[PDB]
Amino acid sequence: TAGAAWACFRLDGRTLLRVRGPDAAPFLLGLLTNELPLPSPAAAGAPPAARAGYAHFLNVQGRTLYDVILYGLQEHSEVSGFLLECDSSVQGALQKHLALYRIRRKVTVEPHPELRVWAVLPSSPEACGAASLQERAGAAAILIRDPRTARMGWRLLTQDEGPALVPGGRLGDLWDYHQHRYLQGVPEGVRDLPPGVALPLESNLAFMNGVSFTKGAYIGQELTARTHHMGVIRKRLFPVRFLDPLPTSGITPGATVLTASGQTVGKFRAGQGNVGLALLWSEKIKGPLHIRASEGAQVALAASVPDWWP
């Protein structure tokens, strides 16, 4: 597969819930930061269509609880509810969260093991050789562009093996998927987004098509809207690369990111290998930075601005 155009990653860290019932839409709208992804009204010849969107579930304090990708699938000129793609490790907690609010509402929430979550990323950055993909929508497979950024390729929800639907697709090593996210500054899951600690706008939610300022009320809206409108977001998650060999255990989440003069300009969040994310003061990412290790020499790191941010 030296000539593969696409790498297909089985995302064991992500899982699906199906939310259905007559009140599913208003119910989810009150809990999420975004509009729901509803396919456009269907034409006579009714070829199935799916829509994806990004959102967070926030707490009443305005902090991120869960990052989710939302999928709406249209088949008989109607939508049969939504799929919620969440971190596997919080699937139980997210069910309990939905149950707390689902009191007396016509809504069903169930695990959807029928589809497994895959990502499909280009083998080449901007190669544009060939093998543009086409959206697919059916109960057995949905292939749809990542709603956060085109830098994240395609999501594939399927019963079967990834490459069997993607021309020029090969199986990918999960390490490379996470490497890609950290190089591109894309947070995903509970290590990047600690529930009740990560703040949505500092997590670049508005750069990732994940928040609406026109939608009706939702949990955590008041603080989110206030933060958005009161000025520039002072701290954000940025991609970082370590420039010095790391310690055996790596960098501890929360490790302070310092200037040459020892000023705190943020904290390491999470990563893999020599790359990761750090929550940094946006005006201070420029001068050489470091983290203190056991011996106060290393560890140098460089922060950068993702090319897909606005």
From Swiss-Prot:
**At what positions is N6-succinyllysine found?**
267
Q: What subcellular compartments does it reside in?
A: Mitochondrion
Disulfide connectivity for this sequence is none
| GO CC term, one of those recorded | mitochondrion
Q: Which PANTHER family match?
A: TRANSFERASE CAF17, MITOCHONDRIAL-RELATED (PTHR22602:SF0)
| Complex formation | Monomer. Heterotetramer; forms a dimer of dimers with ISCA2. Interacts with [2Fe-2S]-ISCA2 forming the heterodimer [2Fe- 2S]-ISCA2-IBA57 complex; [2Fe-2S] cluster binding is absolutely required to promote the complex formation.
Query: Which family does the record claim for this protein?
Result: Belongs to the GcvT family. CAF17/IBA57 subfamily.
Q: What is this protein called?
A: Iron-sulfur cluster assembly factor IBA57, mitochondrial
The protein's gene is named IBA57
